[PDB]
Amino acid sequence: QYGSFCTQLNRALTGIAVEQDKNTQEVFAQVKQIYKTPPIKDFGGFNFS
Amino acid sequence: KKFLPFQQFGRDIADTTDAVRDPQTLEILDITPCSFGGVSVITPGTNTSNQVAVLYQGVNCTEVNVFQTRAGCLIGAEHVNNSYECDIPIGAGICASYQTQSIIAYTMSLGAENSV
Amino acid sequence: AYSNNSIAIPTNFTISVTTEILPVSMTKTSVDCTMYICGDSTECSNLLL
Amino acid sequence: QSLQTYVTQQLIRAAEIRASANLAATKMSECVLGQSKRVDFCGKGYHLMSFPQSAPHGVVFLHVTYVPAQEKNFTTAPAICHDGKAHFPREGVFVSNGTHWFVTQRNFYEPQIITTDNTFVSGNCDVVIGIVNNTVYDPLQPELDS
Amino acid sequence: QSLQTYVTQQLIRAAEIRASANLAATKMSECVLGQSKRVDFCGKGYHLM
Amino acid sequence: KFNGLTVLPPLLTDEMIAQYTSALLAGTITSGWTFGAGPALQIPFPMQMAYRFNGIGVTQNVLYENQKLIANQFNSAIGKIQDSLSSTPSALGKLQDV
Amino acid sequence: KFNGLTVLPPLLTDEMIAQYTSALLAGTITSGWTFGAGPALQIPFPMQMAYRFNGIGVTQNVLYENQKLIANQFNSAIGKIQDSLSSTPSALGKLQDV
Ligand SMILES: *[C@@H]1O[C@H](CO)[C@@H](O[C@@H]2O[C@H](CO)[C@@H](O)[C@H](O)[C@H]2NC(C)=O)[C@H](O)[C@H]1NC(C)=O
Ligand SMILES: *[C@@H]1O[C@H](CO)[C@@H](O[C@@H]2O[C@H](CO)[C@@H](O)[C@H](O)[C@H]2NC(C)=O)[C@H](O)[C@H]1NC(C)=O
Ligand SMILES: *[C@@H]1O[C@H](CO)[C@@H](O[C@@H]2O[C@H](CO)[C@@H](O)[C@H](O)[C@H]2NC(C)=O)[C@H](O)[C@H]1NC(C)=O
Ligand SMILES: *[C@@H]1O[C@H](CO)[C@@H](O)[C@H](O)[C@H]1NC(C)=O
Ligand SMILES: *[C@@H]1O[C@H](CO)[C@@H](O)[C@H](O)[C@H]1NC(C)=O
Ligand SMILES: *[C@@H]1O[C@H](CO)[C@@H](O)[C@H](O)[C@H]1NC(C)=O
Ligand SMILES: *[C@@H]1O[C@H](CO)[C@@H](O)[C@H](O)[C@H]1NC(C)=O
Ligand SMILES: *[C@@H]1O[C@H](CO)[C@@H](O)[C@H](O)[C@H]1NC(C)=O
Ligand SMILES: *[C@@H]1O[C@H](CO)[C@@H](O)[C@H](O)[C@H]1NC(C)=O
């Protein structure tokens, strides 16, 4: 009898759920190449271990 | 509309009967509500004057110094050919002001032309 | 190809034109609360008061 | 209840749209009215300029950027030792094709002879790790010689 | 009513989290992928990396 | 529609927005970044682009010695923007969502 | 939990996020800021730090003549970051609150 209230609720929650993955993608997926450090960690004394 | 001999009512909105078959004469007539719309009062400060203009929003100037703007019918303001900065926003590029002393309605100016 | 005495220097360039799309404004909506709830009914509007 | 729900969602959506519009105004100021050094703020690459275009309910920025294209390997040194002096590039980087040393601007290969107008002297040759022996030419010596 | 309250609170919290995520993406672009001259945007002091 | 719901027109028409964008484009093309900070100072466009090359750490002779190639690259990039815009129907997703 | 409430997993796993962060770190370490603007251009890390010293208005010889001291300072600072984060948990409250 209440109509489409909770369909609205599920739509809002789904929007939030998608936005979470969008947030993570925008933060961390800022490069399409997967770069790797050389096996010899010689950087002139700088230590990134 | 083509109401087949079994169809009595008509609903393209599904909650309001927008059409109906008259029982006496089987002519089918559509039902459109009479009219409605907002009413806005354009005024300068009462610390300046008591004159007002009235905007009947989104209605033609027949349902109601009569100026048909894209925002509706304006009554009590004279339309001027000049362009100024917006003072009271009316809508769709039209603005209103109070100048010597009457309320004027005009197309707003975006700025002075300048060729480099 | 990292090393302690190697560098990569570009010898050319590309002029790149990219598109960024940003929403600015929404449709301006107005609702007549009484008309939506209690359309042209005076008993309903009196109750809504 | 339905009307209140609609108005609440409209308020939240309007807040999001206001954030987007503030970002658009900032980009109009910093990318169209100027050249931005902020990485990725205007486009991908080194920002040169931006052009705005109106769109229904929004804006489209055409970001013109500079992208290095065809890189080449060279050998580097942090400084050059000539007469017990350590020479450092005023602008650019010391670069070597295998046999000869040059100084280049950092973003575009343009080899130039290492000269005293090209470099500046700081200290002796015993402090810098990886300093490379090479000659630094003085343009004044031929002029006062001839 | 309880479900509506939860969903509205989630929407507001999601807006705040989205603002935080946008700031984090901007800092990833300007502090990690480059050297920023914006005072205090990438730590206290003159930003190196 | 007929239940007390109305749509108010924007104050600025689409033509006025186009006029503002055209004014911004003309100012940028004819005066670079000067009109933003004050009076518009005219400068030939290749010299402005040389300024911007200096701004990204590249010497001006790189632009001047490659002016035709750079102009061709820019023109073709704008043309590719045109082509892609009229080829990807999901390009304007951010606006259509609104 | 038991009343129609479900928790959806994130699209990217923690391992994938770690992979992205490791790729960013490797790119920055091996190529400085070049991989963010285009192709990754390798450069010795002391030379990159000299570039950054120039970026903050300090001459390159200041870095090169103090390379060991600067590297020791950086290493000690990173070690202290590890120590401080492992010492007190309230520093991560911003995350915990979420
Ligand atoms: C970089 O620093 C780490 C410490 O943060 C060094 O790791 C230590 O190495 C020594 C010698 O191999 C070991 O005795 C220690 O147990 C290690 N400590 C830890 C916490 O792993 C590492 O050796 C340094 N790298 C270089 C190249 O010197
Ligand atoms: C490195 O660069 C130097 C200078 O550009 C090269 O030396 C020149 O080589 C050309 C051959 O094409 C000669 O005509 C010039 O007379 C040389 N100049 C000098 C000053 O000797 C050198 O060959 C390059 N080395 C490599 C491996 O490419
Ligand atoms: C750069 O040239 C100098 C000479 O100007 C070299 O100095 C010699 O260094 C060796 C040790 O490597 C000493 O045994 C000699 O007595 C030094 N001679 C002179 C005249 O100074 C220096 O070694 C060279 N550097 C490199 C890396 O080859
Ligand atoms: C009902 O009566 C009226 C009046 O005589 C007539 O016009 C109409 O046709 C009648 N309805 C039908 C369905 O015949
Ligand atoms: C108002 O009605 C007149 C009647 O001829 C018509 O010409 C005009 O276009 C109408 N204006 C609007 C805004 O509907
Ligand atoms: C504007 O000027 C034209 C003639 O150029 C005239 O026909 C028109 O009526 C004027 N508009 C107003 C509002 O007076
Ligand atoms: C740079 O690339 C362009 C193509 O965009 C090419 O025409 C030109 O010859 C290249 N320059 C060099 C020096 O290779
Ligand atoms: C530089 O040398 C490495 C090998 O160590 C090679 O993989 C890389 O492609 C070279 N770079 C260029 C631009 O040729
Ligand atoms: C670079 O590394 C090599 C070993 O591969 C070493 O012989 C050389 O001395 C190092 N040079 C510098 C400047 O670190």
Short mmCIF file of C-alpha atoms in Angstrom, two decimals, chain F residues 27-62:
data_model
loop_
_atom_site.label_atom_id
_atom_site.label_comp_id
_atom_site.label_asym_id
_atom_site.label_seq_id
_atom_site.Cartn_x
_atom_site.Cartn_y
_atom_site.Cartn_z
CA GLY F 27 40.27 36.23 -24.89
CA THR F 28 42.48 33.16 -24.58
CA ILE F 29 43.26 33.04 -28.31
CA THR F 30 44.08 36.74 -28.67
CA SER F 31 45.68 37.55 -25.30
CA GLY F 32 46.70 34.29 -23.61
CA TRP F 33 46.40 34.43 -19.82
CA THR F 34 46.64 38.23 -19.55
CA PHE F 35 42.91 39.02 -19.74
CA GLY F 36 42.31 36.86 -16.66
CA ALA F 37 44.69 38.91 -14.50
CA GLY F 38 43.85 42.33 -15.96
CA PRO F 39 43.52 44.15 -19.28
CA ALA F 40 43.74 41.90 -22.32
CA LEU F 41 47.24 42.16 -23.81
CA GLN F 42 47.38 41.00 -27.42
CA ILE F 43 50.19 38.64 -28.43
CA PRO F 44 50.63 36.51 -31.58
CA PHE F 45 49.44 32.98 -30.89
CA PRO F 46 52.73 31.17 -31.75
CA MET F 47 54.49 33.43 -29.24
CA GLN F 48 51.86 32.62 -26.61
CA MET F 49 52.37 28.91 -27.26
CA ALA F 50 56.12 29.52 -26.91
CA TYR F 51 55.35 31.12 -23.54
CA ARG F 52 53.47 27.98 -22.55
CA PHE F 53 56.34 25.77 -23.72
CA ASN F 54 58.60 27.85 -21.47
CA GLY F 55 56.02 27.29 -18.72
CA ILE F 56 56.34 23.51 -19.03
CA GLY F 57 60.15 23.68 -19.00
CA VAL F 58 60.79 23.53 -22.76
CA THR F 59 62.75 26.22 -24.59
CA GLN F 60 60.99 28.49 -27.07
CA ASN F 61 63.12 27.50 -30.07
CA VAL F 62 61.61 24.01 -29.78
#
